[PDB]
């Protein structure tokens, strides 16, 4: 009853165009690893496109000014808050369904994550164009936590290689008892082929 999403290879506008509709239609969405997102256009143009937003501070008391968040999470939450009516009680009661994380926390690693195909760089971009990462961007613009994230995204890949090995190890045992037995399940398959399940 709760969606999950990856963040590698997906675009920024195309993902937030699916998610700002699926939240308002009553569906809790969690989007993890929002530093592998990449942006269209080359790098230095999206950096001058962003530093011309960092130069815009309210003049007389910038503490009331535009809160410039720098993390790639609170940037993806920024560019969802724009696609929502965030002044009314149907916007402020929708943003408490969304939950954004940098990296990937332990409550959402032992779960199968879904992947949107309509927002991928290899689909929605010609392959002779340029793209730009978001993580190396936030590091260039004031994010202090790549030296922690890179090794906590190293200890789980090492844990999942192990979980894939013991997934293969139970599958081979399954196809060898499925080779020994089928003398006595010879009749429970001539009823499945004529209904289309093992072709």
């Amino acid at each position: 009853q709760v969606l999950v999403l990856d963040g590698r290879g997906h675009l920024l506008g195309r993902l937030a165009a699916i998610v700002a509709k699926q939240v308002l239609l009553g569906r809790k969405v969690v989007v993890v690893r929002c530093e592998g997102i990449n942006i269209s256009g080359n790098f230095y143009r999206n950096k001058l496109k962003y530093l011309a937003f960092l130069r815009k501070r309210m003049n007389t008391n910038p503490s009331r000014g535009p809160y410039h968040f720098r993390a790639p999470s609170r940037i993806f939450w920024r560019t969802v808050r724009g696609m929502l009516p965030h002044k009314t009680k149907r916007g402020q009661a929708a943003l408490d369904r969304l939950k954004v994380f940098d990296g990937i926390p332990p409550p959402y690693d032992k779960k199968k994550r879904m992947v949107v195909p309509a927002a991928l760089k290899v689909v929605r971009l010609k392959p002779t164009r340029k793209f730009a990462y978001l993580g190396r961007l936030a590091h260039e613009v004031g994010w202090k936590y790549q030296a922690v994230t890179a090794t906590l995204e190293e200890k789980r890949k090492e844990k999942a290689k192990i979980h894939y090995r013991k997934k293969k190890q139970l599958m081979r045992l399954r196809k060898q008892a499925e080779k020994n037995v089928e003398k006595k399940i010879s009749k429970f398959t001539d009823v499945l082929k004529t209904h289309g399940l093992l072709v």
């Binding site: 003049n59 007389t60 008391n61 910038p62 940098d102 990296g103 936590y145 922690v148 994230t149 906590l152």
Partner: protein, 394 residues
């Protein structure tokens, strides 16, 4: 239109929340960087300001007029009694910051530290946290201790240590003590933790932390001066005499069309009692306390190589507003932050100090005894007697 004549700005915008500091004791924000090369060692230290005095030394720098001349300088005196270790505390490394992990105290915590945790020591029944000290004599406790320590072997990255000051040795009025965390830099966590496990409930003096004339930083709280104006605060000019509604003001606050007022205009409020962090104070001398051996006490603290009198660093009639000094002392350079009887936090240097003036080695010649309390004209007691003579009071 435009301002006709240019001018630089009054004050700095780097310190703008000029408010009464929410903490009296200084707080270290930035500990130095470790490497697994050096052996383990502490970084910060906690003391108490007393007063000021002269000094007269020789100068060794080539390329100036003052070479091989007897200059004078002005120092402070910072009394630093030995500190006590009462517990360890670890830290973890997260993307959301740096979370604390686990804290382990000692068995017999003194009552100087049982105070700080209370407000009204007279009315309380002094249930001084005596369920946790059931975990150092029973064999159901030293399991969870050995697993807490193996957890901070494995999952911890930075280890600060809890230390409190020692108040019985001071001529101050109060009887309460200052706790503080101090980071241990060194090798791995196994070495750092096996080092600090030994020092548990011990005294730690100054010289096993510092050395000599290492450039250090001083974090402290300013003298406070009440609710001063804008002339005493930002140091502007005064209006002329012919005014009507005062003259210690600022005339044009803001422009018209920005209908607000900008936040950088000098306004009137609190002055002093702030947090500040001075860098590169150099140490000249680390003395020693009044130690009593062979019946009587020996007090040749300020005996240099050339005076070789037996006088100590207490002047005539004690320091003003502090008392007398029995413990050890460091001898800084220049003024420091804080009024008298103010607690002060020392720290080693952040920076790779390699120049020609922070490598100078220091020889003293003559430490003064100036009883500020009145103009001084003597140095010690007996010379005043062997010079005035006998009195009617005798």
């Amino acid at each position: 239109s435009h301002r006709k004549f240019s001018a630089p700005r009054h004050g700095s915008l780097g310190f703008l929340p000029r408010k009464r500091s929410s903490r009296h004791r200084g707080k270290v924000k930035s500990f130095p960087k470790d490497d697994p090369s050096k052996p383990v060692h502490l970084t910060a230290f906690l003391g108490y300001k007393a007063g000021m005095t002269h000094i007269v030394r020789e100068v060794d720098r080539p390329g100036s007029k003052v070479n091989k001349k007897e200059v004078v300088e002005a120092v402070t005196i910072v009394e630093t009694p030995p500190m006590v270790v009462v517990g360890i505390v670890g830290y973890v490394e997260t993307p959301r910051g740096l979370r604390t992990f686990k804290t382990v105290f000692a068995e017999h915590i003194s009552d100087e530290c049982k105070r700080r945790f209370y407000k009204n020591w007279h009315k309380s029944k002094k249930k001084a946290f005596t369920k946790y000290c059931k975990k150092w004599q029973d064999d159901a406790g030293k399991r969870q201790l050995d697993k807490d320590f193996s957890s901070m072997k494995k999952y911890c990255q930075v280890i600060r240590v809890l230390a409190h000051t020692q108040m019985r040795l001071l001529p101050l009025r109060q009887k309460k003590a200052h706790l503080m965390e101090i980071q241990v830099n060194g090798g791995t966590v196994a070495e750092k933790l096996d080092w600090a496990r030994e020092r548990l409930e011990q005294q730690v003096p100054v010289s096993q932390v510092f050395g000599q004339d290492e450039m250090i930083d001083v974090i402290g709280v300013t003298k406070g001066k009440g609710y001063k104006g804008v002339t005493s605060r930002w140091h502007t000019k005064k209006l002329p005499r012919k005014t009507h509604r005062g003259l210690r003001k600022v005339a044009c606050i803001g422009a018209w069309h920005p209908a607000r007022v900008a936040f950088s205009v000098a306004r009137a409020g609190q002055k002093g009692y702030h947090h500040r962090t001075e860098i590169n104070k150099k140490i000249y001398k680390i003395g020693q306390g009044y130690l009593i051996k062979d019946g009587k006490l020996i007090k040749n603290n300020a005996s240099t190589d050339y005076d070789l009198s037996d006088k100590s660093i207490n002047p005539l009639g004690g320091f003003v507003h502090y008392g007398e000094v029995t413990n050890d002392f460091v001898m800084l350079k220049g003024c420091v932050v804080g009024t008298k009887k103010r607690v002060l936090t020392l720290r080693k240097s952040l920076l790779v100090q390699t120049k020609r003036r922070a490598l100078e080695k220091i020889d003293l010649k003559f430490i003064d005894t100036t009883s500020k309390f009145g103009h001084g004209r003597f140095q010690t007691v007996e010379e005043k007697k062997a010079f005035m003579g006998p009195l009617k009071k005798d």
